[PDB]
Design a binder for this molecule. Structure first.
Ligand SMILES: *[C@@H]1O[C@H](CO[C@@H]2O[C@@H](C)[C@@H](O)[C@@H](O)[C@@H]2O)[C@@H](O[C@@H]2O[C@H](CO)[C@@H](O[C@@H]3O[C@H](CO)[C@@H](O)[C@H](O)[C@@H]3O)[C@H](O)[C@H]2NC(C)=O)[C@H](O)[C@H]1NC(C)=O
Ligand SMILES: *[C@@H]1O[C@H](CO)[C@@H](O[C@@H]2O[C@H](CO)[C@@H](O)[C@H](O)[C@H]2NC(C)=O)[C@H](O)[C@H]1NC(C)=O
Ligand SMILES: C[C@H](N[C@@H](CCc1ccccc1)C(=O)O)C(=O)N1[C@H](C(=O)O)C[C@@H]2CCC[C@@H]21
Ligand SMILES: *[C@@H]1O[C@H](CO[C@@H]2O[C@@H](C)[C@@H](O)[C@@H](O)[C@@H]2O)[C@@H](O)[C@H](O)[C@H]1NC(C)=O
Ligand SMILES: [Ca+2]
Ligand SMILES: [Cl-]
Ligand SMILES: [Mg+2]
Ligand SMILES: [Zn+2]
Length: 604
């Protein structure tokens, strides 16, 4: 470690810990920046050499974390929990968690190489027939094609290409990750991830939330299944079975927005998928980012700074060079550089993703002046919710009208059902997926799911919660969890489940602050400077305060609550139930064993 980066001496008292935390702050922004910068150089340009460099930067990060970590223990281990300064307690608490810096050097290098190799496999995997990439090629197929065989070829090709080679590395990664966090006091890595919510009843509270939401999902599923049956017929859709996992618009069946045209209740009303209009009007990536920004400035939140526009990667590079397309928002920890990296496509769902990513940036802009240890969401779910809350307003027919994307205006029960149905495809359909992913990963980290059951347990959960089935036979050579970005990239998932509930709590509160008095699902907070001030208070808090209290100050309650989401969707929840009953649907999938046949001429 460079001499300037090494910790000095501090008295072993709270006065010393404050000086310690200040000295750490100085050196940590330098260390984080080199690490983030090397990650950027790799992710926007995947080469052997960029991986080498990133690995070197990560090693320097661990060295730093180890030295400042061990000094924090040496001086403050028996006393930091009794410090008067709550923010100081949180800073020291972070610094003394070593994670992968607990590993000896050889295992640190193994760990860093595993992350790099798993990232590369995911972001460079192709399906060959001339080879299709995930983004845009396979994404477009899953979203747009209605050919059973084509969908299958993309689904199977991607799962095989990405999943199969990851499996040996994932096993090695799990074991090392566990070894690292065990020396911080956690039974397994999952326990450390869950600790961020600082709630002893976290798993039970999530389970209770899901119990309230499940009927909504069952009704949506049944209704969509029926529409798929009308299209694909009895051979490929079982009206009492799970839906084939490739037919729902998305590689992971996680959001069903893309099959809206097949399920829309009242096709005579305004077309709520404005993708056609965006293309017709010639929208590109930077228009999408600028329109998102202006929503934020309408609230008197910050614009994107010059460094964002100069640094960001907003389209897939046309020089064909390899990049991580999966959209992400970057804090370089120097209070100046902030960037999005997205292979943006001109679609309505991408417009929402742009808002999602810009929500991350806006958090980073608002808390940049906190101590480095506190530059995070009040919990991870908060960071995930910010952009989605604004996108709830943007998606409204009224708002789309204001920005030139929906010329016809209507306010009637049919138009409302269409809107709420479309939103259900994006929000309700995701809930079981958002919930299951980390149930899977928590079982893997705990050892309940050994390598010998990775795919068996994955599909158990996928069927259990989403009521989908794989459209070709799978076995334990397959590693279908690995074909989802967050697994090889070691990004936790439960945050997205929390976010999908929390965003409706946020929406409700911001709408009330805006002075809006209509139905929750027609609220648009655009240009509410009062809504803006209430959201800014959250963003400025970082992780300086318990999330329960930040939530209470914002929405008036100190807990996750499904009631705002239920209220938002209530009209369509009622309508879907009525439709399914009148069609005599079976809710659920009692033929749990059923899988579709292969197409006759597949794949030739
Ligand atoms: C779309 O239309 C709905 C429904 O409008 C209501 O019923 C229709 C059939 C018509 O007869 C309308 O005249 C009637 O308002 C609109 O929702 C309604 O909006 C108003 C707010 O502008 C609500 O009234 C307010 O209620 C609060 C109490 O909560 C009072 O403090 C206010 O004094 C005020 O009267 C009304 O409750 C609300 N009701 C429904 C049916 O949910 C909606 O605003 C409109 N949307 C758009 C985008 O134009
Ligand atoms: C992608 O990363 C590679 C490193 O793997 C970059 O290669 C360097 O490129 C500059 C300019 O072409 C040369 O002067 C260096 O000698 C290269 N290094 C090596 C080791 O080959 C490459 O430039 C990057 N591409 C982009 C557009 O950023
Ligand atoms: C597109 C988005 N990408 C992520 C990347 C997170 C990340 C974290 C660390 C390193 C690299 C990436 C995010 O911005 O949270 C994402 O994966 N998801 C999720 C997903 O697509 O699975 C669902 C969430 C709502 C809309 C977009 C969100
Ligand atoms: C796992 O599956 C591998 C390949 O897929 C198989 O081939 C297709 C045509 C179907 O038969 C499908 O049901 C199969 O999964 C096999 O190569 C492999 O040997 C299978 N078994 C093991 C132990 O890996
Ligand atoms: Ca779409
Ligand atoms: Cl999380
Ligand atoms: Mg989509
Ligand atoms: Zn996010």
């Amino acid at each position: 470690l460079d001499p300037g980066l090494q910790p000095g001496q501090f008295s072993a008292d709270e006065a010393g810990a404050q000086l310690f935390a200040q000295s750490y702050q100085s050196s940590a922004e330098q260390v984080l920046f080199q690490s983030v910068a090397a990650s950027w150089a790799h992710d926007t340009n995947i080469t052997a050499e960029n991986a080498r460099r990133q690995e070197e930067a990560a090693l320097l990060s661990q060295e730093f974390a180890e030295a400042w970590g061990q000094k924090a223990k040496e001086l403050y281990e028996p006393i930091w929990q009794q410090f008067t300064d709550p923010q100081l307690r949180r800073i020291i608490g972070a610094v003394r968690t070593l994670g992968s810096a607990n590993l000896p050097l050889a295992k640190r290098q193994q760990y860093n190489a595993l992350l790099s190799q798993m990232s590369r496999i995911y972001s460079t995997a192709k399906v060959c027939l001339t080879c299709w990439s995930l983004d845009p090629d396979l994404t477009n197929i899953l979203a747009s094609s209605r050919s059973y065989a084509m969908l299958l070829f993309a689904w199977e090709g991607w799962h095989n290409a990405a999943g199969i080679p990851l499996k040996p590395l994932y096993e090695d990664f799990t074991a090392l990750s566990n070894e690292a966090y065990k020396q911080d006091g956690f039974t397994d890595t999952g326990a450390y991830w869950r600790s961020w919510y600082n709630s002893p009843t976290f798993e039970d509270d999530l389970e209770h939330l899901y119990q309230q939401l499940e009927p909504l999902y069952l009704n949506l599923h049944a209704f969509v299944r029926r529409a798929l049956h009308r299209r694909y017929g009895d051979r490929y859709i079982n009206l009492r079975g799970p839906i084939p996992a490739h037919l729902l618009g998305d590689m992971w069946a996680q959001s069903w927005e893309n099959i809206y045209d097949m399920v829309v209740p009242f096709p005579d009303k305004p077309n709520l998928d404005v993708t056609s209009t965006m293309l017709q009007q010639g929208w590109q990536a930077t228009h999408m980012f600028r329109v998102a920004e202006e929503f934020f400035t309408s609230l008197e939140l910050s614009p994107m700074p010059p460094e964002f526009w100069e640094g960001s990667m907003l389209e897939k590079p046309a020089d064909g060079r390899e990049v991580v397309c999966h959209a992400s928002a970057w804090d370089f920890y120097n209070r100046k550089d902030f960037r999005i990296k997205q292979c943006t496509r001109v679609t309505m769902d991408q417009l929402s993703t742009v808002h999602h990513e810009m929500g991350h940036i806006q958090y980073y802009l608002q808390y940049k002046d906190l101590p480095v240890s506190l530059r995070r969401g009040a919990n991870p779910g908060f960071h995930e919710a910010i952009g989605d809350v604004l996108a709830l307003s943007v998606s409204t027919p009224e708002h789309l009208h204001k920005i030139g994307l929906l010329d016809r205006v209507t306010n009637d029960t049919e138009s409302d059902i269409n809107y709420l149905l479309k939103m259900a495809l994006e929000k309700i359909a995701f809930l079981p997926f958002g919930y299951l992913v980390d149930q899977w990963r928590w079982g893997v980290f705990s050892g309940r799911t050994p390598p010998s059951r990775y795919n068996f347990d994955w599909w158990y959960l996928r069927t259990k919660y989403q009521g989908i089935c794989p459209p070709v036979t799978r076995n334990e050579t397959h590693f279908d969890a690995g074909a989802k970005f967050h697994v090889p990239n070691v990004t936790p998932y439960i945050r997205y489940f929390v976010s999908f509930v929390l965003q409706f709590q946020f929406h409700e509160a911001l709408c009330k602050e805006a002075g809006y008095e209509g139905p929750l699902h027609q609220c648009d907070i655009y240009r509410s400077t009062k809504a803006g001030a209430k959201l800014r208070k959250v963003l400025r808090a970082g992780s300086s305060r318990p999330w329960q209290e930040v939530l209470k100050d914002m929405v008036g309650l100190d807990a996750l609550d499904a009631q705002p989401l239920l209220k938002y969707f209530q009209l369509v929840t009622q309508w879907l139930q009525e439709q399914n009953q009148q069609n005599g649907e079976v809710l659920g999938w009692p033929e749990y064993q059923w899988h579709p046949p292969l197409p006759d001429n597949y794949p030739e």
